[PDB]
Design a protein around this nucleic acid. Structure first.
Lengths: 112, 86, 175, 50, 136, 44
RNA sequence: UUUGGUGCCCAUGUCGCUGUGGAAACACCUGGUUCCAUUUCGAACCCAGCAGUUAAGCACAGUGGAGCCGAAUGUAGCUGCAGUGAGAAUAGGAAAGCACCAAGC
RNA sequence: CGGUCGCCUCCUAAAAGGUAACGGAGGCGUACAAAGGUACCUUCAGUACGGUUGGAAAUCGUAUGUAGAGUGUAAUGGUGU
RNA sequence: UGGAGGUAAAGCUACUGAAUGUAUGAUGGCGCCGGCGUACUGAAUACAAUUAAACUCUGAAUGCCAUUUAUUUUA
C-alpha cells in the first residue's frame, strides 16, 4: 500500500489544489508540518511560489508538544505587515499542538 | 406499387443546443459575460474565471482571453483571463 | 506468556539462521484478520446475532459489518443485506488469540495435519480453515443452526515465502 | 397528472409561503422544517398544510 | 459467403471507395498475388464461387490466402416499391476494393499452373486484374 | 465497549503446564483434558 | 554543495531491476499514561520519547527489461502536377528538471 | 389505409454555429428530505493464489491492473484521492 | 499572428465490434497409476496483415473569431 508518509503529501496537494481553485483572494498561507519527532511551519505565498518566512525544529527550537512555535513567526509577519493570511490544516487535523500554533498566531495580531 | 413501410422506425429528432466559441482570443471582455458553453468539461477553469454548475464557463474578471494546453497529452484546454497591464 | 519468549529467543534464533543486519527484516507477525460469512442462507436464522455472540465470546472486539463488493445472487443475495463479520486484530489480543488457537483445543482430532502445502500466495500469507467451532473450549450450546469453523488468515511484513516457512515451523505448525 | 408537489405553511403566519417536492409513497411523516419567513423576517419552524 | 456473426448496426453507409488503397497492396504469404487496377464492389457469392473454383483446380501442397472480407451491408427494397419510406432490408454483403488492391495470394506450388489458375479465378471477378510477383 | 478479558488457571492432566495469559473473565477455571504433549503433531 | 520540506509542469518527467548512504534531519520504532480516535483493530488519526534501524519510503551509480518519445527520404488528402505536408515505420535519445526555503555549508 | 404531430441524446452534419426527408439508432411526460450543502475519512471493475458447508467467481487477505469501476435514467461528454 | 476543432487520410497487440495465417497451449473429452501419450476442444502470452456513421492511442488544409498593420467606406 502507500508509504504512510505520502498520505500527508496527498492531503496537502488536494487541499492546496482545492483552495487555489477556490481562493480568489490573494492571501499568503501559514503551512504546517507534523513529522514524527518534530514540527515545522512555513509562511508561504501563492501566485508567486515564493517563501515569506519559516520556523522549524532545525530553526530556533529546543528539545521537542510546545507553544514556542506559534508566536515566533507572527512578529516577522507583522514586520512584513500582512496580518491577514490563510491557515493550512496540513496532513493532520486541527487539534493538539496545531491548535496552540493557531491560537499563538491569532493572538499576536494575525486575523485568520 | 404505392405501398411502403408503415409504422416506420425512429425518425424523431431533438433541437440543437446553440453552444461553441462565443468568445475568442483577441477581444476585450466585460466581466460576468459568457465565454464558452459545452456539454461536459472540454475546457477547464484556470485563473480569473467563474464556473457555474450548469455546464457554464464565464468570465469572472476583466482582461484578455487565452487558451493553453494541459493534461496528459495536451488533451485539456484551460481558459485563462489575463489581467490588463497596470 | 509467550510474547516474551518469542521476541527474546526465537527472533534472535531466526536472525542468526539467515544472517542479517536488520532486526525488522526477519519473519515476524504484526497483523492477523479473521473473516466470517454466511453464503448458505440470508434468512435471519441464527445469523447476524449468532455471529455477534460467537465473535464476542471468542475474540476481544465486537463484530463489524461489511457488504459484498459486487451483487451476485445466483444463491439468493439481493437488496444489500450485508453478510458475516470481520476482525482485523492487533496488539496484545492478537497474541492472546494466537495462544488460544495453537495450544488450547486444536489437539482434539487424531489426524489434525494442518495445511503446510499450497497455502502461500507468494507474499507471506497463511490460512487455516476448519469445519468445527465447538472444537474450542470457550463455546456455548444451542446457539447455532449448524457448526462451522472460522477461517483464520494471517499476513506478515515479509514478502518472501521461505521466511513464512520458518515462521510456521518455529511455532510447531503441522506439516 | 401525478400530483407529487405539496405546499408548506408558516406556523407563525398560517399562510402559504413555500412549495416543496414531497411524494407520498415513502415519506409518511410530516416535514417539520425551519424555513425563512419574510413576514416574520427570520427563521421559523414550518409544518405541513394543504 | 462468409457471413458476419454479429453487427452493431444493420443499415450503414456503403463506402467512399475512390482514392488510393487503405492497404492490402502488400503481399505477405503467397508467391503470386492478384492486384486490381481500380476499385469497385465485390458481392459475397462471387467470392465463394471464385474460392471454390480456385481450390478445386489447386493441388495438394500449395496454399492460398484472401486479403478481403465483406464488411458492408446493402439495401435493395423489393420491386414495385416507391422511392422513400424508410430503408429496406439487407440482401447480401459487399467487400470494398480500392485502387491498387491485392485480393489473392498463393504459394508453394509450380508457377505455370498458378498463373493459369489465377487467370481462371480472376475471370470471375468484376474488376480487371494484374499478376504481381512475390515481394522479398 | 467490549466486555473485559482476563485469564484463569489452565488445567490439564496431559500438560501439567498452565496456559494462562489472556483468554477472558466470563468463565472460571478453563480446563481441557487433551493437550499437545499427547498430540503427535504438536510434539517434537 | 549533503539531506529534509517544498511549489511549477504533469510517463523525452514514469514502471521495474541491481548495489552504496544516511552524521543533523525524514521515516521506521518503544506504547496508549492522557487531547483524540476507530462502522473494530493506536490498522488509520492523534499524544512523549528513542534501545536500535539503512532492512523500508528518499537520494546516489549502473539497467534500455517495460512503458514513453521520436529526425532525415518519400508518402495518400488538401488548397491551384506547385505549394501544402500527416499517420506508420526507423536512426535515435531519454534513469527528468525548472524555482523557493533552514540548517550541515 | 398505415404511422407520425411535444421534448431530450447521438449519427447523418462536410474539424466555429446552424443546416432534410415517411433517414438510422434510443428514450422521456421522472425520483431523492436525502442520492442536497458543509467539514472530515476514504477510492477502481477484474485477474491470480489461499482456504468450513462455497462449483465459476459468492465472504475475506494479499500482489495484480490503468478505467474495460461507478455516475438514479437513452446516449454523449466529463470525472483515476 | 494563435487558438477554439476531431473532418478527409491513416491506424485496430491504443479501445469497441468485426476479422485473416503462422506459434504454444489453459478448461473440458479420451486411454491411465498419484500422474499420464493426449489423434480432441482449444483462455492468450508474441509474431504478420485487415474493416467501420454511431471505433479513435493520433491528425491536416480551407473555413470561421479579434486584434497588429494598409486600403474604400457613410455604410
Amino acid at each position: 500500500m502507500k508509504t504512510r508518509t505520502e498520505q500527508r503529501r496527498l492531503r496537502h496537494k488536494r487541499i492546496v489544489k482545492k483552495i487555489r481553485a477556490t481562493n480568489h483572494d490573494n492571501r499568503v498561507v501559514l503551512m504546517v508540518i507534523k513529522s514524527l519527532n518534530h514540527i515545522s511551519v512555513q509562511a508561504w505565498d501563492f501566485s508567486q511560489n515564493i517563501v515569506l518566512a519559516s520556523s522549524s525544529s532545525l530553526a530556533l527550537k529546543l528539545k521537542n508538544n510546545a507553544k514556542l512555535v506559534g508566536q515566533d513567526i507572527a512578529d516577522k509577519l507583522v514586520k512584513l505587515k500582512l496580518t491577514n493570511v490563510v491557515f493550512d490544516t496540513g496532513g493532520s487535523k486541527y487539534h493538539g499542538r496545531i491548535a496552540a500554533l493557531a491560537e499563538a498566531a491569532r493572538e499576536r495580531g494575525l486575523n485568520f | 406499387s404505392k405501398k411502403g413501410v408503415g409504422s416506420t422506425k425512429n425518425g424523431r429528432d431533438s433541437h440543437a443546443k446553440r453552444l461553441g466559441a462565443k468568445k475568442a482570443d483577441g477581444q476585450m471582455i466585460r466581466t460576468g459575460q459568457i465565454i464558452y458553453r459545452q456539454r461536459g468539461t472540454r475546457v477547464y477553469p484556470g485563473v480569473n474565471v467563474g464556473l457555474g454548475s450548469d455546464d457554464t464557463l464565464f468570465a469572472l474578471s476583466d482582461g484578455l482571453v487565452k487558451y493553453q494546453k494541459f493534461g496528459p497529452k495536451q488533451g485539456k484546454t484551460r481558459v485563462s483571463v489575463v489581467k490588463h497591464k497596470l | 506468556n509467550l510474547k516474551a519468549h518469542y521476541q527474546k529467543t526465537i527472533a534472535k534464533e531466526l536472525q542468526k539462521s539467515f544472517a542479517f543486519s536488520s532486526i525488522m527484516q526477519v519473519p515476524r507477525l504484526e497483523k492477523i484478520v479473521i473473516n466470517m460469512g454466511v453464503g448458505d442462507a440470508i434468512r435471519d436464522s441464527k445469523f447476524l446475532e449468532s455471529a455477534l455472540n460467537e465473535l464476542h465470546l471468542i475474540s476481544g472486539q465486537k463484530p463489524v459489518a461489511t457488504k459484498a463488493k459486487n451483487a451476485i445472487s445466483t444463491y439468493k443475495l439481493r437488496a444489500g443485506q450485508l453478510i458475516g463479520c470481520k476482525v482485523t486484530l492487533r496488539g496484545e489480543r492478537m497474541w492472546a488469540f494466537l495462544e488460544k488457537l495453537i495450544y488450547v483445543a486444536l489437539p482434539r482430532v487424531r489426524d489434525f495435519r494442518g495445511l503446510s502445502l499450497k497455502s502461500f500466495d507468494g507474499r507471506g500469507n497463511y490460512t487455516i480453515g476448519i469445519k468445527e467451532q465447538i472444537i474450542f473450549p470457550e463455546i456455548v450450546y444451542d446457539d447455532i443452526k449448524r457448526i462451522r469453523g472460522f477461517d483464520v488468515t494471517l499476513v506478515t511484513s515479509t514478502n518472501k515465502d521461505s521466511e513464512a516457512l520458518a515462521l510456521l515451523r518455529a511455532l510447531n505448525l503441522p506439516l | 397528472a401525478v400530483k407529487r408537489s405539496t405546499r408548506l405553511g408558516c406556523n407563525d403566519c398560517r399562510e402559504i409561503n413555500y412549495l416543496t417536492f414531497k411524494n407520498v409513497k415513502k415519506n409518511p411523516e410530516k416535514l417539520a422544517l425551519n424555513k425563512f419567513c419574510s413576514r416574520c423576517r427570520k427563521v421559523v419552524v414550518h409544518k405541513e398544510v394543504k | 459467403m462468409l457471413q458476419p456473426k454479429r453487427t452493431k448496426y444493420r443499415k450503414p453507409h456503403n463506402v467512399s471507395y475512390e482514392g488510393k488503397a487503405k492497404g492490402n497492396s502488400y503481399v505477405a504469404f503467397g508467391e503470386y498475388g492478384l492486384v486490381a487496377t481500380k476499385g469497385n464492389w465485390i458481392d459475397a457469392r462471387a467470392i465463394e464461387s471464385a474460392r471454390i473454383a480456385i481450390s478445386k483446380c489447386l493441388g495438394k501442397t500449395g496454399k492460398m490466402w484472401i486479403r478481403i472480407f465483406p464488411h458492408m451491408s446493402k439495401t435493395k427494397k423489393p420491386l414495385e416499391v416507391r422511392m422513400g419510406s424508410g430503408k429496406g432490408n439487407p440482401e447480401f454483403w459487399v467487400a470494398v476494393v480500392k485502387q491498387g488492391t491485392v485480393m489473392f495470394e498463393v504459394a508453394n506450388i509450380p508457377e505455370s499452373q498458378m498463373i493459369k489458375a489465377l487467370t481462371r479465378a480472376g475471370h470471375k471477378l468484376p474488376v480487371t486484374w494484374k499478376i504481381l510477383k512475390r515481394e522479398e | 465497549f467490549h466486555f473485559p478479558s482476563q485469564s484463569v488457571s489452565f488445567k490439564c492432566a496431559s500438560c501439567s503446564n498452565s496456559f494462562t495469559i489472556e483468554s477472558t473473565l466470563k468463565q472460571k477455571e478453563i480446563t481441557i483434558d487433551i493437550c499437545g504433549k499427547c498430540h503427535p503433531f504438536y510434539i517434537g
